[PDB]
Design a protein around this ligand. Structure first.
Ligand SMILES: [K+]
Ligand SMILES: [K+]
Ligand SMILES: [K+]
Ligand SMILES: [K+]
Ligand SMILES: [K+]
Ligand SMILES: [K+]
Ligand SMILES: [K+]
Ligand SMILES: [K+]
Ligand SMILES: [K+]
Ligand SMILES: [Mg+2]
Ligand SMILES: [Mg+2]
Ligand SMILES: [Mg+2]
Ligand SMILES: [Mg+2]
Ligand SMILES: [Mg+2]
Ligand SMILES: [Mg+2]
Ligand SMILES: [Mg+2]
Ligand SMILES: [Mg+2]
Ligand SMILES: [Mg+2]
Ligand SMILES: [Mg+2]
Ligand SMILES: [Mg+2]
Ligand SMILES: [Mg+2]
Ligand SMILES: [Mg+2]
Ligand SMILES: [Mg+2]
Ligand SMILES: [Mg+2]
Ligand SMILES: [Mg+2]
Ligand SMILES: [Mg+2]
Lengths: 56, 65, 129, 106, 88, 271
RNA sequence: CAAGCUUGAGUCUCGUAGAGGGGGGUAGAAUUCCAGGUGUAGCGGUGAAAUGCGUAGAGAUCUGGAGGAAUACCGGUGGCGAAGGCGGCCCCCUGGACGAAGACUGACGCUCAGGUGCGAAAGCGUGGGGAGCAAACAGGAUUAGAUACCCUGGUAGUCCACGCCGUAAACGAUGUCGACUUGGAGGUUGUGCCCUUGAGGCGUGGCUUCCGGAGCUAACGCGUUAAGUCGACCGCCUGGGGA
RNA sequence: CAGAAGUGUGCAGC
């Protein structure tokens, strides 16, 4: 995620763009995912349960 | 809808960088077919072609390098 | 693999009549034709037909009375795993004689009532209620 | 015999030698009763990320029909030839005479 | 696997016709051809167990075909096993 | 291959022996033999200067070519032979001019293999080149330490050296000990590894099998009297000393390299 | 017992999809370590601390190098495999599955005691490798205690080659094979026809996810991939502990 | 962030 601030761009608009960019890139989620190991059985269990709840 | 089925492409070519750049984010990550609408067969062809193009340094692996 | 085509025929009858099928089709065979003939004579089915030369099909037209199956039950008794034969003095009576047993006697396939009248035993194929 | 697509890229300082390598390798295939269905020279082209600190490597692409041993000979000469910085051999479903998008972009 | 031209060779060599690809002699010949070819594979890739399962399928199928042929015609059986070198 | 002997006697119970059927079952090439009489570990004063040496089987010296200076002429491997003088096997090779020589046998080399030496040799095992011509990362053996002096590093069975870096005038080598060392790039080396890599798997079953190789018994210092060894003495099994050599220097950790003239060539000591 | 037949079972011809297997190369991001520059007093960790690291210049930041292991995104109740399992890219060798159209053999089939092979992780042997993680172990905390949970370290091991072991909630807690019996919505992969006009309509095969009808079941539930209606063969059970 | 334990044995509502 990179932001170039345009001429006469307000700084807080640049902050808004930076926040939305890094959120859309998923960087923070990817960092939080990797701080602890997860057994493959646990990964598959969470995936399965998420899919199971994706029903109307 | 899927561009490759509308055209009737037989195989996606890693050398068609003008096409492949439409399916990567600005950070170089492969865009999910959920967003592009690409049919699964062509999504798999995209992924292989993009990885080959990365190895040839035609596309970046990462935003930063 | 298929190893008892007679139980196959009987099961096709049972299932088709439970599903209210108008008619059922199965691979033909001399013994199947004989059994269907006996069932038609006893009135458990409306009709039967055989069609084709190289791979003949057999069709049975099922029978219903007041909206319900005329065949109450149909049960294989002799089977490949355990063959059953009876003497003249031991032929069973199905539903005390309301149903029929089908007996392959030495004179051919016939009802147990016929076999008793003829004085024969045989292999007992099935019970029909 | 099998069809292969071969892309190799060369240190820019060696660009003027690219016609020589080609003539050798095009010989090595054809002298083995292989045949070359096409050759494209893309010249110096910018890299997406630095390799060996280099940039602007000189790309060459060719499509060839050859027996396995000739192609593993060619790849093992690419291995020790210090001019070639990166190489790729991909077996191909069919012969391909049509020019690449990289040329037709010109 | 066994190539097209080698297949046609074996078929035209053991069968009555290029047609009779179902004859038991032709099938046993093709199975023997591939079982012989694969010995050069498993001589090296010893731990390729998954491919060995296919190899053993070929072996047991050939066994069954030979038992059938030996029931039908001991003369054709003898000719076949002598020509192919089976039964050690 | 290595084979375990059946225990038909207590001396055979633990024997493991290397069997190699490619080795020549015949007499060596006599024009390349010399006498090699045993020393018993005694110098020109007649004193024992190295303990535990003496006896063993008679041996002839084979003149192995470590210099490989016969550049630009092909040679074919005639056969592999046993050499009693070293752990590696040696190959007899015949040059196109009819000269014969012995070389260290590299791993996987076989009779009928073609080898060549020189600045333009191919990169394949058994070929010899100046190290400035060898790709970095290559595995080599029989490395010269000075140009033209002949190979001195990585000679034993299964050993090899890896070229880690090149600096124009010098190359950095990772030695088999794990030392990192500079060597000047005009030194030659041979591609590949020394063969007979299973040498280390053999087990000598019995005391007598060490005697055949010329090793005499090693009496423990603690078993001696105080006059003989610093560890000697004690009215039982006593120790209470710090461990030392027979001449009183600390063993089990005290370093002993002291060679300031070569230290500049050493990049990182073994670990 | 003899001779037929083509529907079961096989062979061939043309294609398709795939983390199916074995071997060999190779790329990028990141952690760790080592050298060197910038630069000053904290860093790290926690609920808070301390152990620990730091003025002997750490942490942060930039340049260069070494080495090991795993392959973000793609990625999906997606695919492949008998099961265990299999995920960067490329090459070589190699197994199976499925579809269209025929041609061919002519019951060659199903199941299987004993037997044989494969079989996660941990573990064992011999030789390598060792970044990160981490049984054992040490220190700091917490507590009435704390031989734990948490923190700072850390060995076997995890990785490689060749052997052994042969067990798991090795699970769909559901043996293999064959036939029959109302439907609906989706996924994935072939193929036919129709103005192909498309981001289109209608048919026909393989595998797979979720609802639910008759029926079955103690109930929960299963429900054309049956736990429904039948046939062949095999394995297993006979009150709880002891075991 | 910490927070452990609760002696034995019974009887109506037909
Ligand atoms: K002489
Ligand atoms: K001793
Ligand atoms: K003593
Ligand atoms: K394949
Ligand atoms: K068994
Ligand atoms: K740790
Ligand atoms: K407490
Ligand atoms: K460790
Ligand atoms: K009991
Ligand atoms: Mg000694
Ligand atoms: Mg000793
Ligand atoms: Mg004494
Ligand atoms: Mg003394
Ligand atoms: Mg004492
Ligand atoms: Mg295949
Ligand atoms: Mg393990
Ligand atoms: Mg181990
Ligand atoms: Mg070990
Ligand atoms: Mg810990
Ligand atoms: Mg068990
Ligand atoms: Mg079970
Ligand atoms: Mg349901
Ligand atoms: Mg059932
Ligand atoms: Mg009991
Ligand atoms: Mg208490
Ligand atoms: Mg109580």
């Amino acid at each position: 995620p990179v932001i170039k601030v345009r001429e006469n761009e307000p700084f807080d608009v640049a902050l808004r763009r930076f926040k939305r960019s890094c959120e859309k890139a998923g960087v923070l989620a990817e960092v939080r995912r990797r701080e602890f190991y997860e057994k493959p059985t646990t990964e598959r269990k969470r995936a399965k349960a998420s899919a199971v709840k994706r029903h109307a | 809808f899927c561009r490759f089925t509308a055209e009737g492409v037989q195989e996606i070519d890693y050398k068609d960088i003008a096409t492949l750049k439409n399916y990567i984010t600005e950070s170089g990550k492969i865009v999910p077919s959920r967003i592009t609408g690409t049919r699964a067969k062509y999504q798999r062809q995209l992924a292989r072609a993009i990885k080959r193009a990365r190895y040839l340094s035609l596309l970046p692996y990462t935003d930063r390098h | 693999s298929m190893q008892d085509p007679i139980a196959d025929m009987l099961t096709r009858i049972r299932n088709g009549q439970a599903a209210n099928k108008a008619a059922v089709t199965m691979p033909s065979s001399k013994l199947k034709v004989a059994i269907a003939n006996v069932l038609k004579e006893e009135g458990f089915i409306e009709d039967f037909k055989v069609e084709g030369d190289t791979k003949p099909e057999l069709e049975l037209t099922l029978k219903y009375f007041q909206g319900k199956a005329v065949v109450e039950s149909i049960q294989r008794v002799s089977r490949p795993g355990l063959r059953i034969y009876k003497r003249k003095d031991e032929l069973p009576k199905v539903m005390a004689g309301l149903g029929i047993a089908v007996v392959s006697t030495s004179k051919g396939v016939m009802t147990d009532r016929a076999a008793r009248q003829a004085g024969l035993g045989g292999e007992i194929i099935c019970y029909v209620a | 015999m099998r069809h292969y697509e071969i892309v190799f890229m060369v240190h820019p300082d060696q660009s003027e030698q690219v016609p020589g390598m080609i003539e050798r390798y095009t010989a090595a295939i054809t002298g083995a009763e292989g045949k070359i269905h096409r050759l494209e020279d893309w010249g110096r082209r910018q890299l997406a990320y630095p390799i060996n600190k280099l940039h602007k490597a000189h790309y060459v692409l060719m499509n060839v029909e050859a027996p396995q041993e000739v192609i593993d000979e060619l790849e093992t000469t690419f291995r020790f030839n210090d001019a070639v910085i990166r190489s790729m051999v991909m077996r191909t479903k069919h012969a391909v005479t049509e020019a690449s998008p990289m040329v037709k972009a010109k | 696997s066994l190539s097209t031209e080698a297949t046609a060779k074996i078929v035209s060599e053991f069968g009555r016709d290029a047609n009779d690809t179902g004859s038991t002699e032709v099938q046993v010949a093709l199975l023997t051809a591939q079982i012989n070819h694969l010995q050069g594979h498993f001589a090296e890739h010893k731990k390729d167990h998954h491919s060995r399962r296919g190899l053993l399928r070929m072996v047991s199928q050939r066994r069954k075909l030979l038992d059938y042929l030996k029931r039908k015609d001991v003369a054709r059986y003898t000719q076949l096993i002598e020509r192919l070198g089976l039964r050690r | 291959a290595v084979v375990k002997c059946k225990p038909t006697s207590p001396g055979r119970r633990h024997v493991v022996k290397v069997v190699n059927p490619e080795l020549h079952k015949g007499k060596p090439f006599a024009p390349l033999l010399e006498k090699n009489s045993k020393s018993g570990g005694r110098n020109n004063n007649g004193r024992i200067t190295t303990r535990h040496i003496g006896g063993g089987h008679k041996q002839a010296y084979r003149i192995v070519d470590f210099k490989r200076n016969k550049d630009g002429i092909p040679a074919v491997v005639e056969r592999l032979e046993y050499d009693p003088n070293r752990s590696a096997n040696i190959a007899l090779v015949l040059y196109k001019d009819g000269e014969r020589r012995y070389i260290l046998a590299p791993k996987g080399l076989k009779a009928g293999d073609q080898i060549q030496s020189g600045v333009d040799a191919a990169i394949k095992p058994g070929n010899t080149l100046p190290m400035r011509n060898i790709p970095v990362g290559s595995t080599v053996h029989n490395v010269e330490m000075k140009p033209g002096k002949g190979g001195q590093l990585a000679r034993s069975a299964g050993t090899y050296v890896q070229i880690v870096a090149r600096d124009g005038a010098y190359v950095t080598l990772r030695l088999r000990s794990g030392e990192m060392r500079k060597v000047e790039a005009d030194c030659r080396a041979t591609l590949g590894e020394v063969g007979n890599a299973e040498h280390m798997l053999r087990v000598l079953g019995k005391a007598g099998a060490a005697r055949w190789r010329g090793v005499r018994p090693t009496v423990r210092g603690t078993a001696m009297n105080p006059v003989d060894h610093p560890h000697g003495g004690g009215e039982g099994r006593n120790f209470g000393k710090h461990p030392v050599t027979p001449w009183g220097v600390q063993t089990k950790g005290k370093k002993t390299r002291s060679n300031k003239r070569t230290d500049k060539f050493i990049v990182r000591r073994r670990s």
